[PDB]
Amino acid sequence: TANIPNKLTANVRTRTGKGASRQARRDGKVPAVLYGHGTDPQHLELNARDFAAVLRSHGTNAILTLDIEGTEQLALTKALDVHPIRRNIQHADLLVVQRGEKVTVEVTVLVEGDATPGTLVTQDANTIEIEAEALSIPEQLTVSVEGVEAGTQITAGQISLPEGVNLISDPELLVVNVVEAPSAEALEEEGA
């Protein structure tokens, strides 16, 4: 599992505050902060369109390169804020990471397969935490079910994983649950 970095340009912020940030947002630039173990936090501005395109292309977690006045930085998109209505970007947290480090990564998981007539599909856990190398972060995880019957609880620890990744989450976590299909009597009884 190897990934390639994403190139984008950014500029350092001139003014700091709610007014300046909202003015930049109206203009069409998202404010961001760059902090890490280097003991030198920085605050910068990004392009909303390019950032959204990269987010769509490489999922929630991607490894990014930052161009600050020609300087090259290696950072990871770790935390961010999204507007409840405009579904835009207002803040993102970028953590400086060098090659050869252990980081905590939350990755989404997908379920696919064919179900029996008496099988009801249930997904309680959709995101799991995985410790891996910076350049080895996976974008999605897939699990397959075929001919499941009765109690076929799928355990998070039972999911096959690539090499070089550690399961931070305890094995007690369940990701996919399979139970008997509901009935009209139960459907009409529930909620009354």
Partner: peptide
């Protein structure tokens, strides 16, 4: 105001 809690969907898809 704007809702802060339960702004992101995570139980299913």
């Amino acid at each position: 105001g704007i809702a802060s809690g339960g702004t992101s969907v995570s139980f299913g898809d």
